[PDB]
Symmetry: C4
Subunit: 331 residues, 4 copies
């Protein structure tokens, strides 16, 4: 074995991230303005725009959820607050029309009660929200939710970064599988634990387990540009979950901050000290202020549409079949 | 598959750019001063210097076209202006002697009328000027131009980045194929759409489709140094189209700009907000002022001549057979 | 041979360092708080935490050794001081309870006498401390120590970076093998001699020789983050030896230094001019002040525990079987 | 072909430079102080230290040549001056004892007369000094010199970067082959012409042609650290030629320069505008002042000795058999 030892499986794969690849143009009859951007969030739920906002307390509360749903995507309400308050935010969203909304739950002692209160509040999607879903406790929560409230509510499980973990969530009954262990912009899991999986490879692997069962994959974390959204979908994901790209918007929680004459908003990991209040796996940072959500989404979907034009993809289903070229450091 | 999934074709190639390769020296009887730098722009047109200026409104109007032709290359007049004005610029060039000149046309509703007005004005080369030529509308424009005015005018089609797209333009009747999707210095297609193809690989692939039909390939975009010109031709291109390298010259449109005691000129993508006036695929930037075009071309051709010396290439046709070494990040 | 010449063995391997790999998550029933972090330092000695402090005069004297042992690891006392003083530091550590302690010896003329004085002082571990242990003089010292005092004292040999060198130390009778030629943060061997071996590959190779003989491998040098500790153990090492990561602590020798309003401590290679007082193979630098050792170790072990959680490793022995993904420059 | 096209030979090799590799430690009985650093400069001339100074007018005139020879290496006098003056510098060196000295000649009209005047002056080594020796004019000069004065004078030919070019110089009668097209610190051939060959691969290839004929290879250009000297010799070179590493010394031509409170000396390519006084293939730069040559050489040889210690190489001939590990960008 060229990299050392006598075990070829010790280093199991070469992991690619978004920056490692570009989409290849292909024969096209598709105009960007006419591409169909709709896609499955879950087995049963189709969104008009394949984007969801991260379940983070500097990204998604009721205001962001309402704006995301109106833009044709969805928000996932964070769970770093009391149950009654999270459920009240679900009600606030439903009050603003027939708007789709999701909400995160953990697998702790109070997670079941949280889930039931969200259900009562009329939530459409429950996201079992962990750093590592390949675990009996997480798989049991997914299964029990699906068997109990699964007729009225779609259940998302995550996060995973391997084929076997995605397969386990599929077996548990997940309606969608969320992919991303370590790629987040505010993530320090890669330096603190030395654990992760570059996101293009993680998506390709999870899709290999999920697509043959008709389970959509949500690409979560590491998306820096609108082009990354196109790459993630081309890798086989059905939607993308955004934190950093949406934390700078007016609709996100938190105040404008002014440093050196420029405007910013705070953006922090749910595993940062500030969020948990210990061995943190996230930092507390800042992102440039970007203005209204509607305008950010327009530009993000605009980029996706351009990609669909270049690749001849009339639908997201066709984009999931596009090809990549791998690029070097120079590129 | 080591990079993920079960499909070996998902990541179809490893794409190299100019910085990924160097030309290998070979046995040489060629002195730089005596190398023959002439090359086919199209099937019928041979230039004394294998260089053309980009169809951009911060690079080529009549002044640049005249200077390029006198230097032994050619200018392609941009189309970001009314038809009558573009045609008037063609006439201005023809007024300055028997000078070759090209002009860009789109595939929009007014493109045909633009093309006919350019023809009337005495243009030598029409460039069907798009970001993605692998499209029925573009191929039809190429074909119809070639069948209508193809006896008196050479028709260039572009841009492409794959073998199949180059093949389609050849079948459509292109007299030359222009290569470059995403590599331009002012291009943001790679970050906005996540689409592109590193330029050495794009040239190698397009040449594989074009050379066996005797159709010359124009390498368009991403050339940063005179050495890149030699690499592009060695990859099989017959000419190179330059934007950034010529936007700093006296002959380009626009004014000198002074910032921090240094001189610059504005250089902007035709897909930038400022050019289109939306989801832009180019930026508005600046390049150092470089002085007279004649002098820039001298240095660029000087570098090419040196390369022909090192590789023993007496002609561009011989340079197209030179070999590369791939280098690493360290190199 | 693609990289040149006709000898495939000239470039014998592709060497990976910590930054080249990530740990892959796997099926897990392990909570970080419940993972067992104990591991063999030597054939006979098991530590509660798999960490030892470097034998450097800006890292480990009696104070650091006491604190390391109390934290469940061990200190190795440097040998850049007279024999009587090093032995007095061993006695100082033993005075503070039944605390494990190690001490470095060279292979010079006075090394044997140093070793015997340390033995008299009650040292638990002798570390034959060289830059290159694949040498008859070093192997003889290891063997003679093991045959003379080997019943009461464990003998560590190092450093090595190849399978054959590790094999030689095993044959000589080493109770543990220390791995690292060139990777230290303060090391200039790679630029001065052009010699080294990236540390993940060096560990994989040394482990291939040491594990089948039940000899533990100590990963020494190049660890920058707590995540690197997890990677090193996953590569097959049984413990990690830390210099830079512990030189910033209160317990390390030396004074606080203030530059530009920030606090630092001096950290220098034992091959630096200042340490030797010539062709130095280390620099004299500074590291940020990090506070109490206890707190640094808590965070380092915290990261390791997280990794054990992600990988489903209940023990270090299980972590040594985890898998990697190789990442690119982009990742 | 993964990188494009249908020709596997288009991209003929993967070129490695010094930074791409490290020397692997091996079994050693060699102490650095006792290693034998002598090596063949040419078939007949053995130096005590395997180092020669570049034929550049900011590196080697009589003072540097005298100092190099006294240090056990050799200087090659530049040829950017009238014949009588170069010959007078040869005489000045011979006046300072039985000191070896070389001198550069071109292949121009006056090169033969230059060569004869150097011969009369008592030069030991003539270096046919070009950027590309794979050329009939250069090979003829080498041959004619060798047949005319070859009994009393050793003839070096260069530069080359390929096996075939090295083979041609061997056939022409070269007593040594100098390797390096494009790697020099002050070189812009790689950006101006797009031509070059990373130096480890160039050495491996040239050695494959030269060693079986007993012709020593001189590694010329790109050496930045003393460790690079060890790498070059391990790749199979018999000596290294240094420009930048010696241009900062007291013995080099030119004055001390003070900028921002630090001392520098000018260092310029022989293909720079200033040297030629056009399309330059070198820049005019500055290097830190390093003090006396004797001290620089001590440190450089010190590093080489350390490498010989780590690799168990008692002689340079043994070092030429050492092995490498290839490293990544991270390493
Ligand atoms: O409970 C723990 C500790 C733990 C848990 C299990 C395990 F297997 C190992 C360690 N954490 C730490 C990680 N987070 S997080 O906030 O940083 C996080 C949240 C959403 C997605 C993420 C994806 N990748 C990385 C982190 C992610 C959640 C809480
Ligand atoms: O019409 C569109 C949108 C579009 C069109 C089709 C398609 F398949 C996807 C998206 N554009 C956007 C791209 N440009 S451009 O000005 O930026 C451009 C111009 C010359 C060459 C280029 C090469 N690569 C990249 C851009 C290039 C042209 C207009
Ligand atoms: O005696 C020598 C010279 C020498 C010795 C043998 C040999 F094979 C070649 C050269 N040295 C120089 C290297 N050191 S060190 O202080 O820099 C050092 C100390 C702990 C571990 C290290 C790992 N890698 C690198 C250096 C290391 C020890 C003394
Ligand atoms: O005559 C020419 C032009 C030329 C000559 C032939 C050829 F095949 C192509 C171009 N030159 C330009 C290159 N130099 S140099 O001073 O820059 C130079 C000098 C020593 C070694 C070098 C190694 N690599 C690169 C440059 C080198 C010499 C003069
Ligand atoms: O503290 C943290 N550490 C690691 N990952 C986090 C943390 N907080 C949130 N995440 C994940 O990072 C995603 C957002 O990543 P981003 O869009 O690149 O900023 C979120 O959807 C989570 O999956
Ligand atoms: O706005 C843009 N986005 C992407 N490519 C552009 C744009 N405008 C011009 N181009 C292309 O970039 C080429 C010039 O690239 P450059 O020489 O690297 O600056 C032009 O010839 C076009 O093919
Ligand atoms: O001067 C030196 N040169 C090279 N390696 C050294 C030197 N001094 C100590 N070391 C080694 O570097 C290790 C610490 O590396 P670090 O933890 O990355 O700082 C030590 O345990 C030694 O093995
Ligand atoms: O102007 C130049 N352009 C390219 N190579 C040069 C030039 N001048 C000298 N050289 C070569 O560069 C070598 C020195 O390289 P350095 O030691 O890396 O600075 C010299 O021995 C020459 O072979």
């Amino acid at each position: 074995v060229p990299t050392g030892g006598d075990d070829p499986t010790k280093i199991a794969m070469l992991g690619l991230t978004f920056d490692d690849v570009l989409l290849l143009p292909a024969a096209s009859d598709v105009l960007p303005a006419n591409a169909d951007t709709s896609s499955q969030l879950t087995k049963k739920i189709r969104l008009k725009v394949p984007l969801v906002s991260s379940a983070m307390d500097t990204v998604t509360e009721a205001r962001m959820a309402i704006a995301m749903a109106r833009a044709g995507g969805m928000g996932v309400l964070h769970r770093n607050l009391p149950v009654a308050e999270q459920a009240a935010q679900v009600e606030t969203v439903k009050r603003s029309g027939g708007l789709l909304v999701g909400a995160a739950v953990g697998v702790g002692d109070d997670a079941w009660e949280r889930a039931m209160a969200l259900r009562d509040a009329g939530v459409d999607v429950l996201v079992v929200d962990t750093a590592h879903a390949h675990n009996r406790k997480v798989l049991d929560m997914v299964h029990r939710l699906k068997t109990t409230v699964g007729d009225e509510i779609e259940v998302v499980g995550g996060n995973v970064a391997t084929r076997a973990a995605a397969a386990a969530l599929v077996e548990a009954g997940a309606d969608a599988v969320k992919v991303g262990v370590g790629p987040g912009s505010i993530c320090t899991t890669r330096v603190v634990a030395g654990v992760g999986a570059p996101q293009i490879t993680a998506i390709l692997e999870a899709v290999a387990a999920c697509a043959p069962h008709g389970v959509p994959v949500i690409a979560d974390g590491g998306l820096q540009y609108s082009g990354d959204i196109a790459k993630a979908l081309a890798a086989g994901a059905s939607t993308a979950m955004l934190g950093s790209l949406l934390a700078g918007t007016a609709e996100s929680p938190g105040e404008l901050i002014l440093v050196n004459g420029k405007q910013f908003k705070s953006y922090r990991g749910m595993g940062s000290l500030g969020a948990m209040q210990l061995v943190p796996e996230g930092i507390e940072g800042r992102v440039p202020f970007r203005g209204p959500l509607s305008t950010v989404i327009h530009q993000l979907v605009g980029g996706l549409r351009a990609a669909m034009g270049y690749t001849g993809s009339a639908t997201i289903e066709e984009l999931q079949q596009a090809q990549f070229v791998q690029i070097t450091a120079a590129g």
